Structure formats: C-alpha cells, structure tokens
C-alpha cells in the first residue's frame, strides 16, 4: 500500500533527474542574438455578427475560407469570412454547447456540450438540408473539445477525465484514453495525425497515441488548469494555457519546457492558445477582453488585439496564415489580419 | 456588379439571419434559471411540483420559466458551471432540518455568490424541508448551538413576520438561518446581484409564485442598471 | 508539478494540542489561497478553515471555532495549523488543500472527491 507509493516517487524523481540532465542551454539564451519580430499590428478586417449568445468555440475550414462557430443559443452557424455571409445555421438540440470541430473534408461538422453528446452534422446531404450523420455517446461528462481525424474518425475529450477515439460510421469509442486526473478540457491533433496532446484540469500535458492508445508522454509545468493547448507546426512541440496567466512551450523530444511567456501586469487566465504558419507568433486569449501575440522565441509581446468588450473564449489561426479569428463572449467574431 | 452565386448567397444569408431574429425573440421572452444544491436539499420535489440536463418547464402569468437541473456531472462544478454566465437567476435550495450538513451549503453558497462569472447573477434562496426543522427544533435532542457557537446569543429580530401559529424557538433558528446566509451574500457583491432568501416546505404551491415575483424583480433591477437609473 | 505534503499528526490524548505543518512547492505559494480539509471516517469531505493570501481575511468552521489556531508563512512556502483542546470525534485525516485559481476569493474544488490540487493528508487519532 505503501511501498509503491514511493517507488512513483522513486521515477518521478529519477525522470526530474534526467530532464534537468539533458538541459545544458535555454531557449531564450540560445534565441538571444535572434532579432526581434518588432511591433505586429493587426486590424479587424471582418466582424461576424447575427449569434445570440456568448461565444465558446470555433474552428477554421481546410480551405481558410469557411469557419464554424458555436454559441450558447442552439445554433451553429458555419460563416464565409471572406463575403461575410453565413452558409448555414444548424439548430442544436442542447443550447449548452462549448466546443465544434470542422472536419479536414468539409463535409461534416462536430460540437456537443454539456449533453456529454458529440453531434456529427452533414452538410452535404443529398435535398440539400443539414442533417445529423450520428451523435456520439458514452462520455460520463461534457464535451469539452473534439477534433476530426477524417471523415470517419473524430477524436473527443470530456470532463469525465477521458478521451476517446470514435468510428463515425460504428459509433462506439474504438480507444479510451483514461491518464488524466481530471477534467481534460483541449486536445491538438499533431500535423500527422498519429499524436495528439491534451490539457487537463490537474495542471498537466500528456500525449497520447491514436493507434496504441497509451501515454507515452507527460508534461506538468504548470500551476493551475490547463484549458487551452495547440500543437506547433513542426509537430516535435506543443503550448499551453492555464488560469496563471501563463503560457508554456513543452517539447516532446526534450520533456522539458522552453520557456514560459507571462507579464507581471497580466494575472487573468488563458482561454486559447494558436500558433502562426511558421510558429513564431503565438497568439493566446485572455479573459482581460483582449489577446495579445507573444514571440515563441524571445517570450517577448509583440501586439495586442483588443477588439472585444468581453471574455475571449476561441481563437485559431487560418491553415495558410493569412488571418487569425478571436471569439469572445461578446457573441461576436472578429478576423485579424 | 454581382454574380447569380453572389445574390443566392446574399438571399440565404438574409433570410438566415431573420430567422435569427426570429428565434432570438422567441428565447427572449423565456427565462431560464439555473436549479443546484445538495442531493438532501430536495430539488426533484421542488421541480415536481412545479410542474405537476434534466429540463423542467413552468408558465406563470403567461411567461415561460426554464428550469436547468445540470445534475449529470462529476462532482467539480469548476468549468461546466462557466456555461449559466447569462441565466436569469440561480435556485439554491438548503435543507435547514439537516445541521450536520448546513456547514457545507453555506460553503457552497459563499462559492457560487463570490464566483467570478456568476458576479452578476442573483440568487433564489429556497430554505426547504421547514416543517422537519420545526419538529427538531420542539425535539429538545439536537441544539443548534452545538454546531452553531453563536446561536446562543441571538435574538429573534422585530422585524420578522411569524406566520399564525408558531413557537418562538423556530422561528428563532429560521431567522438564525436566514441571517447567516444574508450575511453570506452581503459579504460581497457591492449590490450588484442580490439573494431572495425564502421558506419552503417541500408541499408549498407557492414556489412557482416566488420565482416569478424574484425574476420581476431581478429584471427590473437589471433594466433599471441598463437606463442608468440605478 | 504541483505537490503537497503534511507533516506532522499521530496518536493524542483527549484535550491535547498537537502541531502539524503542509509543505507547499511547484507554485507560487502567497498569490495562493489556502485551505484545510478534513475526512472523518465514514463521512465525506469538509471544510475547516481558509487562509487568504495575505492573511487579512481568516474564517474558521462552526465546529472548531475559536480552537484551532492557523498560521501563514509565505517566505517559507509552508502552512501552520496549530490544534489544542481536541476531542474524540476530531480523529479524521487533514488533507492540505490549494484554492485551484490564484487571486481568486472563489474556490469551488475544496471539498472534492478527486481533487488534483491537495495533498496525500495525514491521519490524527484521538483516543483514551
């Protein structure tokens, strides 16, 4: 009852060991010579109304043109940024949603809530109107986030303290992931779909592999719950957002954390987090009503975009880099460019 | 000028967003509240009989009231709770007959009243199961001041309103009660979101009344704050 | 990582004081509110006192009211709780618990069955 109590101490700090042997250089002493990005300004090149209610998630299309939303009010409403036009507005069963999901294809849409429920919508039926492919059940809790691996397999996280992988065209959850201590709240599907990495509640990063199922890495750098979480480009490192008004890079091949981006006159939370095109901008939101872009090397802020009134809630960047979307609580969607 | 394409999608995305108008002002003339305590608290009887996430829907003076029961969560309300920022009211019901667990109902009420996102929300008090407190408390086997260490020196206030017919020793505690969870709220808050505390006794047909009387006055306290009048 | 360890605790008789102390280490210890915990066999989690951040605001519950002394100290990342005149029914085990947002005068995950942000507690027996 005891005895292996302290040999998990034993690993835990045979693994602090060999992080901190491995950790000749930082990151911020080795990019000291790199110049800095300067003073980014972003202007809101599109404003997105017609939701109801307060904003909790969006995600960008594989073209960079269409993007879902999802509000508080039953309606998910899929946007063309580009004209300002809305495609389509989806009634939802359950009101309480807080995370969609627009699949690599375009032709399906995921969200769900706290009906614990993942809810696929076709948008390509046949007569021509929106309709449920399958909903997805078995989570013990809401969903928090979910993203699409293909047009049959979704990936899911939910405050059960689970996540899941789910065969769309079966419905049951082909792999269970139950590592986390509790309410995992964002997952980030690696640019090779074989890894994702999600944040939890208890202050801790693990990666998970989609095939194996197992965890075959864990991150605890941080002090309060993770909610936020998205994978650099590269796919080899991967940020984080918490309540402590920080953001940490992690990197997989090094087990360690690179820096730590966070200013003393910020001590809101994080909501979001989203890399650029390349990874030198990161771009996190803030409960303060505005998002600020950090330097992934420097850890120094470049600009802040404060074009919201209320809690910024979502934020992802644009496959081909040419705007990033913030949500807030403001039931409005601004685009920055 | 514009294409056939351009004009289909301008037509779709104006007869979209009327369609938002339209549902928007259907949502606008409902309520919805948010219904949480302790599984002793005696939330499903309330609900019943109002009646007579698990949704319950009542109409008084011709006005919809949605009632949420979340009750289908683990036992953290830290995030989910984030989800009721813009209801109407939140519905705290506390069994008093139960002092062992009184302690943990007023913690919870001091952490959903001090939340940050629930700063401008008021709060329906509903002190439920009144009639099992007033037997314990005309039992002589459980004092209040065993758990209480201040009950012994309080007073029941003259401004109270005894109904016809009661003990002063009840109405003693009742009042006791009732002052530990208005201090509770007056902790803080600055005015902004205020607690509507009241009797239940878990027969009462009343409590329907009560929360349309509460959400009338929270409306008109919030519109009041919207026109500055306030 | 986020740990705590209490120190402290064990075999005392009724009406003794005893002293036990929670070591804090992976955060910052004074932007952080403090709680203690306490787990009666056979019952569920409850809260005896909170600790504010600079200590202006100190609050105790309606059962050990006005006996337990608790105590700050910030420089050292510690927590005192300083316990006399016990009695039998005190026999639970105090579970060090951390507020799970710092500046935040709200702090729903105290009395959690699976709470993440506490410590593996110590077991106090008051006994003849």
């Known amino acids: 009852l005891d005895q292996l109590r302290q040999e998990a101490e034993q690993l835990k700090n045979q693994i602090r060991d060999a992080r901190k042997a491995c950790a000749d250089a930082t990151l911020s002493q080795i990019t000291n010579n790199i110049d800095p990005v300067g003073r980014i300004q972003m202007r809101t090149r599109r404003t997105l109304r017609g939701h109801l209610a307060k904003i909790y998630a969006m995600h960008w299309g594989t073209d960079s043109r269409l993007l879902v939303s999802a509000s508080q009010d039953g309606k998910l409403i899929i946007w063309d940024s580009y004209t300002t036009n809305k495609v389509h507005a989806i009634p939802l069963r359950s009101s309480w949603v807080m995370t969609c999901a627009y699949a690599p294809s375009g032709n399906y849409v995921a969200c769900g809530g706290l009906d614990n429920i993942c809810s696929i919508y076709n948008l390509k039926t046949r007569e021509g109107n929106v309709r449920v492919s399958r909903e997805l059940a078995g989570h013990t809790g809401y969903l928090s986030c979910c993203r699409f691996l293909d047009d049959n397999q979704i990936v899911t996280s939910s405050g059960d303290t689970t996540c899941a992988l789910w065969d769309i065209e079966t419905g049951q959850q082909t792999t269970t992931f139950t590592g986390h201590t509790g309410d995992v709240m964002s997952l980030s599907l690696a640019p090779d779909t074989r890894l994702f990495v999600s944040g939890a509640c208890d202050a801790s990063a693990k990666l998970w592999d989609v095939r194996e199922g197992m965890c075959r890495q864990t991150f605890t750098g941080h002090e309060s719950d993770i909610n936020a979480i998205c994978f650099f480009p590269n796919g080899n490192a991967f940020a984080t957002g918490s309540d402590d008004a920080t953001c940490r890079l992690f990197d997989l091949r090094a087990d360690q954390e690179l820096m730590t981006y966070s200013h003393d006159n910020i001590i809101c939370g994080i909501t979001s987090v989203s890399f650029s095109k390349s990874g030198r901008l990161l771009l996190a939101g803030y409960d303060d009503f505005n998002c600020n872009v950090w330097d992934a090397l420097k850890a120094d802020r470049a600009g802040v975009l404060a074009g919201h009134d209320n809690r910024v809630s979502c934020l992802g960047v644009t496959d081909d880099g040419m705007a990033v979307a913030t949500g807030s609580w403001d039931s409005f969607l601004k685009i920055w460019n | 000028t514009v294409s056939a394409e351009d004009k289909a999608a301008a037509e779709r995305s104006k007869m979209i967003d009327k369609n938002l108008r339209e549902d928007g002002e259907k949502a606008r003339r409902t309520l919805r509240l948010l219904l949480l305590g302790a599984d002793n608290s005696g939330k499903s009887t309330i609900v019943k009989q109002m009646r007579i996430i698990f949704e319950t829907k009542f109409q008084v003076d011709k006005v919809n009231f949605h009632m949420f029961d979340v009750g289908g969560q683990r036992d953290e309300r830290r995030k989910w709770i984030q989800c009721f920022n813009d209801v109407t009211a939140i519905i705290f019901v506390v069994d008093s007959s139960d002092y062992n667990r009184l302690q943990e109902a007023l913690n919870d009420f001091k952490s959903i009243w001090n939340n940050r996102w629930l700063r401008t929300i008021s709060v329906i008090l509903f002190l439920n199961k009144q009639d099992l407190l007033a037997e314990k408390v005309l039992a002589g086997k459980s004092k209040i001041e065993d758990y209480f260490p201040e009950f012994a020196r309080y007073t029941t206030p003259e401004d109270a309103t005894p109904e016809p017919g009661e003990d002063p020793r009840v109405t003693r505690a009742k009042y006791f009660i009732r002052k530990e969870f208005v201090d509770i709220s007056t902790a803080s808050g600055d005015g902004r979101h205020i607690c509507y505390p009241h009797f239940t006794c878990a027969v009462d047909t009343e409590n329907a009344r009560r929360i349309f009387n509460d959400c009338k006055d929270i409306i008109l306290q919030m519109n009041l704050r919207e026109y500055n009048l306030v | 990582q986020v740990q705590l360890q209490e120190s402290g605790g064990g075999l005392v008789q009724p009406g003794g004081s005893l002293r036990l102390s929670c070591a804090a280490s992976?955060?910052?210890?004074?932007?952080?509110?403090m709680n203690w915990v306490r787990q009666a066999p056979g019952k569920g989690l409850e809260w005896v006192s909170d600790?504010?951040?600079?200590?202006?605001?100190?609050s105790y519950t309606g059962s050990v009211k006005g006996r337990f002394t608790i105590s700050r100290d910030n420089a050292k990342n510690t927590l005192y709780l300083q316990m006399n005149s016990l009695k039998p029914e005190d026999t639970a085990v105090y579970y060090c618990?951390?507020?799970?947002?710092?500046?935040?005068?709200?702090?729903?995950?105290?009395?959690?069955?699976?709470?993440?942000?506490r410590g593996q507690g110590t077991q106090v027996t008051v006994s003849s």
């Open positions: 618990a951390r507020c799970p947002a710092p500046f935040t005068r709200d702090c729903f995950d105290v009395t959690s069955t699976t709470y993440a942000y």
């Open positions: 992976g955060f910052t210890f004074s932007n952080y509110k």
């Open positions: 600790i504010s951040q600079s200590g202006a605001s100190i």
